[PDB]
Structure 1
Amino acid sequence: GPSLPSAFDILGAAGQDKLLYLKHKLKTPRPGCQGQDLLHAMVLLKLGQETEARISLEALKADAVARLVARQWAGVDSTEDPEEPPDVSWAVARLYHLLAEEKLCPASLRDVAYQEAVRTLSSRDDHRLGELQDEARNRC
């Protein structure tokens, strides 16, 4: 089942060589590659490089999924008021797309992640549903 811990597991399974390849490659932005910044920070975390990872995640403190990854995976304590956890479905969907492109996981796991994303945004009638449906159809 597509998830945050299953994503880190694939980064473990990729190997130290493929990790450093993804480290050096994801540091530079690419057009039409959402979740590149978040995947970069997770690469540094599976490579034991906590100090660089925390600097990367601080530059992303506006994204709630980037805040949750900084606290529960990079050990950064919250300075703000205690907030309820965020929906990770859409970020996990983008993270799974890049992992499938890099041939680290099957394309079908990106399809399950994009389907579950559509399901979660539908259960609360999100105004960004059509946006995600366009992305799901384009990536999958």
Structure 2
Amino acid sequence: TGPSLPSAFDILGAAGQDKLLYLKHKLKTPRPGCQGQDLLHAMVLLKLGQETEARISLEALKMDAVARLVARQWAGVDSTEDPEEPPDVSWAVARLYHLLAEEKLCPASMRDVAYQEAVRTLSSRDDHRLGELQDEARNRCGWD
């Protein structure tokens, strides 16, 4: 078990094609307070089999390391640069799970677990964005 990139893809898989179409149509235009929407839009397209469009969306996201990892390992886009080491995905995953729980595609407890793991991850390396994340976690999870 556990909140993860592959599990988020499974949650999408399990939502039905109608719901994916709903997410594709909805996620495509931005909202305030919804970091991750763009990456989730691309994953939605990938789960619908729409790889050509998914790859165009991920290319617009290429400055983001997690979007790059998704392009390569789930969209099949080969890197054009020197090897980079895989990124920490925990924050991205928290953000994704937040959207998934808001769409009621998974329980809110799964979002909570994801924010925690992210918080643990950033702590373990004393990341200077830790406070930022903790603020976000508190706000999206409804509690400390």
**Shared fold (TM-score, shorter chain, > 0.5):** yes
CA distance in 2, matches of 1:136, 1:54: 30
Gaps of at least 5 residues in structure 1 are: none
- Cα drift, residue 116 of structure 1: 0.2
Structure 1: distance between partners of 2:109 and 2:63? 30
Shift of 1:21: 0.2
Deviation for aligned residue 1:31 = 0.6
Please give the per-residue CA displacement for 1:34-83, whole angstroms capped at 9, x wherever unaligned: 00000000000000000000000000000000000000000000001100
Number of aligned residue pairs:
140
Task: Point out where structure 2 has 5 or more consecutive residues left out of the alignment.
Answer: none
Deviation at 1:110, TM superposition (A): 0.3
Q: Helix, strand or coil for the counterpart of 1:10?
A: helix
Q: TM-score, normalised by structure 2?
A: 0.97
Identify the residue that residue 73 of structure 2 maps to in structure 1: 72
> Percent identical across equivalent pairs?
99
What CA distance in whole angstroms lies between the structure 2 residues aligned with 1:72 and 1:99?
A: 21
The Cα of 1:11 is off from its aligned counterpart by: 0.2
Q: What is the CA distance between 1:120 and its match in structure 2?
A: 0.3
Alpha-carbon separation, structure 1, partners of 2:86 and 2:102: 29
2:52 aligned partner: 51
> After the TM superposition, which segments of 4 or more aligned residues of structure 1 sit over 3 Å from their partners?
none
**Deviation digits for residues 20-42 of structure 1, max 9, x if unmatched?**
00000001000111000000000
Q: Report the TM-score, using the length of structure 1 for normalisation.
A: 1.00
- Alignment deviations for residues 75-124 of structure 1 (CA, whole Å, 9 cap, x no partner): 00000110000000000000000000000000000000000000000000
Aligned Cα root-mean-square deviation (Å): 0.3
